[PDB]
Design a protein around this ligand. Structure first.
Ligand SMILES: *Cc1c(COP(=O)(O)O)cnc(C)c1O
Ligand SMILES: *Cc1c(COP(=O)(O)O)cnc(C)c1O
Ligand SMILES: [Mn+2]
Ligand SMILES: [Mn+2]
Lengths: 312, 322
């Protein structure tokens, strides 16, 4: 047993497969050619709300005076979405350095926005400060086990969509998605590698694997990947420890290079957090992954990006 | 003499000629866009095509047509004039086939397209942004290189290649009711019309065009070719060309209607795809959606429900905006 069950994943599928897009897998010949593998992009940027976070947010909501949470943007959008549908008012704690377009999008989704400082701590606290003030319930971005169940239903889709899939490269923050995916993937096929991808400026998931024990960022990460700044937690760590095959960390310049490659060559408007998976596959350290592993599916997790970035 | 410069047999042959090198691009949908439009829209995603637009189909078909059974008589060089996208596609096509490319590009053509043409290894030669200057400069470069002109939209093999878009859509959307196609020189909408009217003429073919460059509209009203008096100025930089002698007769006979759209309408539809579909189209590719959202398209019968819009390109500067 881990915090969520295989069973909890299918019930989440059936609980959200009525308002959730079975998003496409797109491919790319020029990108297949720079990798030297056969890349398959799971396009979760096309999802309702702009990222995969509608799954866990719907499933948490289905499966209250208010609902409250902390977000850099995505969960705060997919929660406020799934809660507006049930008439429930919503409060969203969002770091002050957090993306301006993910802020404006949360208010336009109806909810009250309250600014915190950028950290797992300031967030996880200015969150319970509103809970006390509103008597609302909390829905947690990656540790709440309904939310973790919502995201494993990415993995079911990928197994059909890519019949002959060799590896799933997944961006990790709190690890809700990559853990939720490993709970699902590793049962049905264990010759399917599960690689985690993560910026070097925020390498708690790599450090934890190196150390063999939960090793969170103790300084707030400075990284262009605004959506993976969160540390992995207690529920999701065990799964990452046992079922994730490796972790690949990437520099700011690798993330920026690979996100620009998806914009320019694939014409997909991903947020830079979604370029981390590809960054990992194009890395010096990935060029030594067994040439047997050919069929790499990369999760493009979101497209909630401000149409005016540092244009860097 | 009843024959147009191409038939459907040319399109099926183009498909064979190129299918091994061009992507069979997806047809994506958006429930929020269907809501705004009040129709079921199907976005044929030619921005995912190689070189970032559909132009690779025609440029590759024409190239392949120029190469004989032995190496003898193969072109020394290929020459064209282009606002950027045909230049790219021809350079890439010529590169696969080991032929040198010389592209004549207007100075005022987008920088990203100029950079792309150079990245693929062409020599770029600059002209004024007019139909006439593009042609005279390209004729100078032909006489100097002993090269062969592959015209952006009047060459039959290019028209035939762009028509393979319609072959795929017909497969991808079984109960398609209409195609909407941006029109500049008309190679693309002529090859589509030919293909759609030959196989399933109950499907509508509609041209979409900026009102700032409405020579297709005005030519259809008059019943004769009537180009733009002045070079057209519009944010839809891919469709400033005028229609020509080879595409005019097909557009005349087989294109059902022409919808013109304002600059603001093009801007708005383009932003709507970027934000709502997360698809990086260039403004010329928002012309078809602008047209479906226009006041005037409101008189398209409610029976014309399943509308396929060709998103023809994704070649836009990322740092450049407004
Ligand atoms: C939340 C998020 C992730 C990572 O999910 P975790 O469960 O936090 O690992 C990756 N990409 C995007 C765009 C996200 O919003
Ligand atoms: C060239 C082009 C068109 C117009 O094609 P024509 O055959 O000249 O009508 C439309 N959209 C894009 C992106 C183009 O590059
Ligand atoms: Mn981390
Ligand atoms: Mn015109």
């Amino acid at each position: 047993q881990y915090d969520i069950s295989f069973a909890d994943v299918e019930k989440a599928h059936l609980n959200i497969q009525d308002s959730v897009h079975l998003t496409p897998v797109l491919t790319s010949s020029i990108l297949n050619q720079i990798a030297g593998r056969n890349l398959f992009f799971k396009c979760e940027l096309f999802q309702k709300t702009g990222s995969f976070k509608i799954r866990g947010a719907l499933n948490a909501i289905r499966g209250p005076k208010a609902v409250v949470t902390h977000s850099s943007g995505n969960h705060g959008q997919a929660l406020t979405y799934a809660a507006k549908l049930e008439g429930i008012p919503a409060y969203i704690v969002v770091p002050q350095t957090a993306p301006n377009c993910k802020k404006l999008a949360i208010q336009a989704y109806g909810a009250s926005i309250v600014y915190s400082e950028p950290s797992d701590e300031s967030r996880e606290n200015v969150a319970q400060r509103i809970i006390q003030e509103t008597e609302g319930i909390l829905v947690h971005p990656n540790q709440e086990p309904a939310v973790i169940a919502g995201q494993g239903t990415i993995a079911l889709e990928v197994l059909n969509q890519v019949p002959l899939v060799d590896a799933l490269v997944v961006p990790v923050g709190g690890g809700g998605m990559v853990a939720g995916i490993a709970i699902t993937i590793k049962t049905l096929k264990p010759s399917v590698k599960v690689y985690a991808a993560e910026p070097s400026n925020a390498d708690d998931c790599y450090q934890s694997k190196l150390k063999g024990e939960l090793t969170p960022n103790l300084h707030p990460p400075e990284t262009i990947a605004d959506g993976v700044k969160s540390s992995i937690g207690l529920n999701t760590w065990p799964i990452i420890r046992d079922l994730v095959d490796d972790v690949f960390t990437v520099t700011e310049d690798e993330i920026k290079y690979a996100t620009q490659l998806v914009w320019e060559r694939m014409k997909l408007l991903i947020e830079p957090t979604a370029g981390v998976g590809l960054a990992a596959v194009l890395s010096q350290h990935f060029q030594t992954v067994s040439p047997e592993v050919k069929n790499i599916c990369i999760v493009l997790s979101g497209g909630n990006v401000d149409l005016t970035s540092l244009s860097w």
